[PDB]
Design a protein around this ligand. Structure first.
Ligand SMILES: *[C@@H]1O[C@H](CO)[C@@H](O[C@@H]2O[C@H](CO)[C@@H](O[C@H]3O[C@H](CO)[C@@H](O)[C@H](O)[C@@H]3O)[C@H](O)[C@H]2NC(C)=O)[C@H](O)[C@H]1NC(C)=O
Ligand SMILES: *[C@@H]1O[C@H](CO)[C@@H](O[C@@H]2O[C@H](CO)[C@@H](O)[C@H](O)[C@H]2NC(C)=O)[C@H](O)[C@H]1NC(C)=O
Ligand SMILES: *[C@@H]1O[C@H](CO)[C@@H](O[C@@H]2O[C@H](CO)[C@@H](O)[C@H](O)[C@H]2NC(C)=O)[C@H](O)[C@H]1NC(C)=O
Ligand SMILES: *[C@@H]1O[C@H](CO)[C@@H](O[C@@H]2O[C@H](CO)[C@@H](O)[C@H](O)[C@H]2NC(C)=O)[C@H](O)[C@H]1NC(C)=O
Ligand SMILES: *[C@@H]1O[C@H](CO)[C@@H](O[C@@H]2O[C@H](CO)[C@@H](O)[C@H](O)[C@H]2NC(C)=O)[C@H](O)[C@H]1NC(C)=O
Ligand SMILES: *[C@@H]1O[C@H](CO)[C@@H](O[C@@H]2O[C@H](CO)[C@@H](O)[C@H](O)[C@H]2NC(C)=O)[C@H](O)[C@H]1NC(C)=O
Ligand SMILES: *[C@@H]1O[C@H](CO)[C@@H](O)[C@H](O)[C@H]1NC(C)=O
Ligand SMILES: *[C@@H]1O[C@H](CO)[C@@H](O)[C@H](O)[C@H]1NC(C)=O
Ligand SMILES: *[C@@H]1O[C@H](CO)[C@@H](O)[C@H](O)[C@H]1NC(C)=O
Ligand SMILES: *[C@@H]1O[C@H](CO)[C@@H](O)[C@H](O)[C@H]1NC(C)=O
Ligand SMILES: *[C@@H]1O[C@H](CO)[C@@H](O)[C@H](O)[C@H]1NC(C)=O
Ligand SMILES: *[C@@H]1O[C@H](CO)[C@@H](O)[C@H](O)[C@H]1NC(C)=O
Lengths: 130, 25, 49, 145, 270, 97
C-alpha cells in the first residue's frame, strides 16, 4: 500500500499507487470507475475492503535556463509533481522548492518581488542575479 | 460559473493567479 | 480572455506503460512532438492574452 | 548528461536562448508486481481419484467427469507417489496456468507390463479389448506400482 | 412420485404495463453521482407484460383453474410474483422439456436451493408439497413430484441449507418479488429483488433495480421455460399467488447512479 | 535429402534440443549436454528420475514416410543498402557520365 506497483486484481492488470479507500461498495461489486469511465478503485478479494487505484505520479520536465551566452547554470521544474516524489529520479538537492506548479530545483526562493523574467506559472517567475 | 491525469493529461496553471488578476483589475 | 492550458503526453496516451507500443509509435517519429508543439503553442498564448 | 545537454539536444543547438523549455516526461517506475485474487475456495476432488480406496477393473473402466472446481496439481506431478506421469498434449508444468473446458478422469487397475498399452495408438489385449486413447489425445496419464 | 391431474387447469391471462420495473444492474462496477448509458437486453418501459392472474373460485370449492404453461424464453425473461405463502418454488428452462434432450431444473425446497442440468423426464405438471404444523409445531416437505428421470447431469449445485418458514404479518398484499433471467454464451445469469409494498391489484408503479444474485455456466440452449407451484397421486390443496412475465429486448438504457452507487432512476432511450 | 543422408537403420548422428530454461534469441547457438531437471529436485551427473539429457537424435531411415525423412536446410541471411556492399548479383557495370 501507498507504493507504486504493477497490480493485477482478478486479471485487471495495471500500474498505480494502491491506497485504502473511504468509498463503500455494495456486496455484488468488485471495481469502481471515475467520471472518465476509467477504473479508480477495486475490492481486495481475499479480505473484502476497497482500495483506491491512484495513478503513480508523472509530469512534464521543464528546464529553466538563462542564455548559454550568460551561463551554463540551469534549474529544473517537474510540472504537477509534488517535490517528495522527485528524489525517485539532482536528487542530491541542496536547493529545492515545492509550489503550486510542481517542484523547482537548483533555484533560490527570494521574498523580494522583482518583475517577472522567466515565467514558471502560478505567480512564480525565475531570473539570474547576485 | 460551476466547473484525466493518468492518460498523460495535465491542466497547467496560468502565470497570473486569480488574485493577480484581481489586483490588475 | 483565456482558456485552461493543457499539456498531453502523446506517448502515455497512446502507449502508457508499454515499450512494445513505444517501438511501434517510434515508426511514426515526429507526430507526437508535432502535437506537443501545437499544445505548447496554445498554452503560452494563455499567458500572452 | 545533464538538463542543459537535454535542452541543447531538444532544440538541436549547441547554444540555447533564455527561457523555459519542455523535455521528456518524468514518470514513476513500479517498485514490484502484485497479484490479488479471491481466496482459493475449493479444489477438484483428487483424493477420491488417485487416492480412492478402490479402482475399477479396466474391463469396466470408470470415467469421473469433473467441473465447478480448481485443478491444482502441486500435490500431483510434484509428488514421488507415482513412478509414471506423461502428458500427451501439455507440459505438466502448465496445468495450473492453462485452463480446461470440461474434464473426465478415468480410473482403473492394470498389470504394470500393460501400462505401456495405455499410451495412444496401441495394441495388446487392453488396447485391443477394453481401453483406448485417441491418436490426438491431449491428456495426461499417471501410473504407479 | 410423478402422477398428474386429468383436469385442464390452463385458462386465463391479462395485460399490464411494466412502467419502469425490470431495470437491473448491468455490471459489477461502482459509479456514483453519475449518469451512464449502456446497450443490453432490458424489459422495455411501459411494455405489455402478461399477468397470470388466478381467479377466485366463487362458484366452486377449490382450485379448478390453476395454470403453469410452458412459455417461450427469447432474449431472456423478466419474472415477478405477488405471492404470500411461498407458492412459487422454482422454474424449468430448456428446449424439448421431455427427456429427449437436456434441460435446466432450478428449485427452492424447504431446506435449500437446487440447480441441476440433465436429460430430465419432467412431470407433465411438476410440483412440490408439505405436511403442515403436524404435532411437532413444524412444517415439513414431503411431496416432490418434478421428474420421473434425470439421466445425464453435467451440472449440479445445491445451496447451503436454511429453514424456510412463513412468519410475520400485515394484511395488504405486502411483497413484490422480481427476477431477470438471461443466457449469454452459455453463462446463465439471475438478477433479483424482494421489496415490500402495500397494493390491491396491479404491478406497482415505481422504481427499484435488481442486483445480480447468481451466474451458472450451464452451456445449454433454452428456448422455453415454466415455473414450479406448490401444495400422493391425487387429492390436494394449493394456496393463492400470482405472477407476471415479459421478454427483454436489446435496448439502450440511461442509468442514474446516486452517490452510493445504486441505480436510482433510468431512461429507456427508445 | 533422404537419398543423401538416410540409412535403413537411422542416421543418429543428427541432434536437436528438447529442454531449456528459456527460448534462445535470434541467430543464437547452444553447445551443451548439461542435464535438465524436470522434477523440483536437483539432479547432478548423467541421469536420474525426472532428469533429462537435453539432446535427442534423429532416426533418419528411407523406409520412413516423407517428412519423417531428412531435410537439409540452408538459411541465407544478409543485410542490405544501409552500408557499403561486399557481395553483388551478376549485373554488369556500364560507363559513367
Ligand atoms: C371441488 O369442486 C370442484 C368443482 O365442483 C371439483 O372439480 C371437479 O372435479 C371433477 C372430478 O375430478 C371433474 O369431473 C370431470 O373431470 C374431467 C373434465 O374436467 C372429465 O374427464 C371427467 O369425465 C369429469 O366430467 C370436474 O370437471 C371438476 N370441475 C372443473 C370444471 O374442473 C374439485 O375436484 C373439488 N375438489 C374437492 C377436493 O372436493
Ligand atoms: C483468506 O485467508 C485468510 C487467512 O489466510 C483469512 O483471514 C484470516 O482471518 C483471521 C480471523 O480474523 C485472522 O486471525 C488471520 O490473521 C487472517 N489471515 C490473514 C492471512 O490475514 C480469511 O478469512 C480468508 N478469506 C475468507 C473470505 O475467509
Ligand atoms: C505533497 O505531498 C505530501 C504528502 O506526501 C503532502 O503533505 C501533507 O500535507 C498535509 C497538509 O499540511 C498534512 O496534513 C499531511 O500530514 C502531510 N503529509 C506528509 C506525509 O507530509 C503535501 O500536502 C503535498 N503538497 C501538495 C501541494 O499536494
Ligand atoms: C431438500 O432437497 C435436498 C436435495 O435433494 C435434500 O437433501 C438431501 O437429503 C438426504 C437425506 O438427509 C441426504 O442423504 C442428501 O445428501 C441431501 N442432499 C444434499 C445435496 O444435501 C433435502 O433432504 C430436502 N428436504 C426435504 C425436507 O425434503
Ligand atoms: C446420455 O445418455 C443417453 C442415454 O443413455 C445417451 O444416448 C445414447 O447415446 C449413444 C451414442 O450416441 C446411442 O448409441 C444410444 O442409442 C443413445 N441412447 C439414448 C437412450 O439416448 C447419450 O449419449 C448420453 N450422453 C453423454 C454425454 O453421456
Ligand atoms: C446512502 O446510504 C447511506 C447508508 O445507508 C446513507 O447514510 C445514512 O443516512 C442516515 C440519515 O442521515 C444516517 O442516520 C445514517 O447513519 C447514514 N449512514 C452512514 C453509514 O453514515 C445515505 O443517506 C445514503 N445516500 C443517499 C443519497 O440515499
Ligand atoms: C555571447 O557571449 C560571448 C562570450 O562567451 C560574446 O563574445 C558574444 O558577444 C555574446 N553574444 C551575444 C549576442 O550575447
Ligand atoms: C519571507 O517571509 C515569509 C513570511 O511572509 C517568512 O515565512 C520567510 O521565512 C521569509 N524568508 C526569509 C528568507 O526571510
Ligand atoms: C493421498 O492422500 C493420502 C492420505 O489420505 C496421502 O498419504 C497421499 O500422499 C496422497 N496422495 C496424493 C498423490 O496426493
Ligand atoms: C397489448 O398488446 C396487444 C397486441 O399484441 C393488444 O391487443 C392489447 O390491446 C395491448 N394492451 C395492453 C394494455 O398492453
Ligand atoms: C413429526 O416429525 C417426525 C420426525 O421429526 C415424523 O416422524 C412424524 O411423522 C411427524 N408427525 C406428523 C404428524 O407430521
Ligand atoms: C446450441 O444450439 C445451436 C443452434 O442450434 C447449436 O449450434 C449448438 O451446437 C447447440 N449446442 C448444444 C450444446 O446443443
Amino acid at each position: 500500500k501507498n507504493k507504486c506497483v504493477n497490480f493485477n486484481f482478478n486479471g485487471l492488470t495495471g500500474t498505480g499507487v494502491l491506497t485504502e479507500s473511504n468509498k463503500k461498495f455494495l456486496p455484488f461489486q468488485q471495481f469502481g470507475r471515475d467520471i472518465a469511465d476509467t477504473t479508480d478503485a477495486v475490492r481486495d478479494p481475499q479480505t473484502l475492503e476497497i482500495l483506491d487505484i491512484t495513478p503513480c505520479s508523472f509530469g512534464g520536465v521543464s528546464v529553466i535556463t538563462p542564455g548559454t551566452n550568460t551561463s551554463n547554470q540551469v534549474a529544473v521544474l517537474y510540472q504537477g509533481v509534488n517535490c517528495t516524489e522527485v528524489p525517485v529520479a539532482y536528487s542530491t538537492g541542496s536547493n529545492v522548492f515545492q509550489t503550486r506548479a510542481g517542484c523547482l530545483i537548483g533555484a533560490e526562493y527570494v521574498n523580494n518581488s522583482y518583475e517577472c523574467d522567466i515565467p514558471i506559472g502560478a505567480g512564480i517567475c525565475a531570473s539570474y542575479q547576485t | 460559473v460551476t466547473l484525466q491525469k493518468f492518460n498523460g493529461l495535465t491542466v497547467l496553471p496560468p502565470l497570473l493567479t486569480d488574485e493577480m488578476i484581481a489586483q490588475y483589475t | 480572455v483565456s482558456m485552461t492550458k493543457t499539456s498531453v503526453d502523446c506517448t502515455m496516451y497512446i502507449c502508457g506503460d508499454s515499450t512494445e507500443c513505444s517501438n511501434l509509435l517510434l515508426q511514426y517519429g515526429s507526430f507526437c512532438t508535432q502535437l506537443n508543439r501545437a499544445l505548447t503553442g496554445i498554452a503560452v498564448e494563455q499567458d500572452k492574452n | 548528461l545533464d538538463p542543459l545537454s537535454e535542452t541543447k539536444c531538444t532544440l538541436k543547438s549547441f547554444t540555447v536562448e533564455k527561457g523555459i523549455y519542455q523535455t521528456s516526461n518524468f514518470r514513476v517506475q513500479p517498485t514490484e508486481s502484485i497479484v490479488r485474487f479471491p481466496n482459493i475456495t475449493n479444489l477438484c476432488p483428487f483424493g477420491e481419484v488417485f487416492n480412492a480406496t478402490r479402482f475399477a477393473s479396466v474391463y469396466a473402466w470408470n470415467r469421473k467427469r469433473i467441473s465447478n472446481c480448481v485443478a491444482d496439481y502441486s500435490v500431483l506431478y510434484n509428488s514421488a507417489s507415482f513412478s509414471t506421469f506423461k502428458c500427451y498434449g501439455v507440459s505438466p508444468t502448465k496445468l495450473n496456468d492453462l485452463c480446461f473446458t470440461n474434464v473426465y478422469a478415468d480410473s482403473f487397475v492394470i498389470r504394470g507390463d500393460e501400462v505401456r498399452q495405455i499410451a495412444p495408438g496401441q495394441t495388446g489385449t487392453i488396447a485391443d479389448y477394453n481401453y483406448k486413447l485417441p491418436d490426438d489425445f491431449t491428456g495426461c496419464v499417471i501410473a504407479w506400482n | 412420485q410423478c402422477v398428474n391431474f386429468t383436469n385442464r387447469t390452463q385458462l386465463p391471462s391479462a395485460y399490464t404495463n411494466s412502467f419502469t420495473r425490470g431495470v437491473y444492474y448491468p455490471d459489477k462496477v461502482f459509479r456514483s453521482s453519475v449518469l451512464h448509458s449502456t446497450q443490453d437486453l432490458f424489459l422495455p418501459f411501459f411494455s405489455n407484460v402478461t399477468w397470470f392472474h388466478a381467479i377466485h373460485v366463487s362458484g366452486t370449492n377449490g382450485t379448478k383453474r390453476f395454470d403453469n404453461p410452458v412459455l417461450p424464453f427469447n432474449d431472456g425473461v423478466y419474472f415477478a410474483s405477488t405471492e404470500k405463502s411461498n407458492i412459487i418454488r422454482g422454474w424449468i428452462f430448456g428446449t424439448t422439456l421431455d427427456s429427449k434432450t437436456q434441460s435446466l431444473l432450478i428449485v427452492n425446497n424447504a431446506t435449500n436451493v437446487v440447480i441441476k442440468v440433465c436429460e430430465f423426464q419432467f412431470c407433465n405438471y411438476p410440483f412440490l408439497g408439505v405436511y403442515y404444523h403436524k404435532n411437532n409445531k413444524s412444517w415439513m416437505e414431503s411431496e416432490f413430484r418434478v421428474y420421473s428421470s434425470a439421466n445425464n447431469c453435467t451440472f449440479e449445485y445445491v445451496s447451503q441449507p436454511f429453514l424456510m418458514d412463513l412468519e410475520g404479518k400485515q394484511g395488504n398484499f405486502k411483497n413484490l418479488s422480481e427476477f431477470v433471467f438471461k443466457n449469454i454464451d452459455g453463462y446463465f445469469k439471475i438478477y433479483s429483488k424482494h421489496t415490500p409494498i402495500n397494493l390491491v391489484r396491479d404491478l406497482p408503479q415505481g422504481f427499484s433495480a435488481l442486483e445480480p444474485l447468481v451466474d451458472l455456466p450451464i452451456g445449454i440452449n433454452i428456448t422455453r421455460f415454466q415455473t414450479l407451484l406448490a401444495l400422493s397421486s391425487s387429492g390436494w390443496t394449493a394456496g393463492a399467488a400470482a405472477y407476471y412475465v415479459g421478454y427483454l429486448q436489446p435496448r439502450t438504457f440511461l442509468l442514474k447512479y446516486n452517490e452510493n452507487g445504486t441505480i436510482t432512476d433510468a431512461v429507456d432511450c427508445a | 535429402s533422404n537419398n543423401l543422408d538416410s540409412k535403413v537403420g537411422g542416421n543418429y548422428n543428427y541432434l536437436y534440443r528438447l529442454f531449456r530454461k528459456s527460448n534462445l534469441k535470434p541467430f543464437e547457438r547452444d553447445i551443451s549436454t548439461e542435464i535438465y531437471q524436470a522434477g523440483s529436485t536437483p539432479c547432478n551427473g548423467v541421469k536420474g528420475f525426472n532428469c533429462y539429457f537435453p539432446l535427442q537424435s534423429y532416426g533418419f531411415q528411407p523406409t520412413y514416410g516423407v517428412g519423417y525423412q531428412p531435410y537439409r536446410v540452408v538459411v541465407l541471411s544478409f543485410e542490405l543498402l544501409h552500408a557499403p556492399a561486399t557481395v553483388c548479383g551478376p549485373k554488369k557495370s556500364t560507363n559513367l557520365v
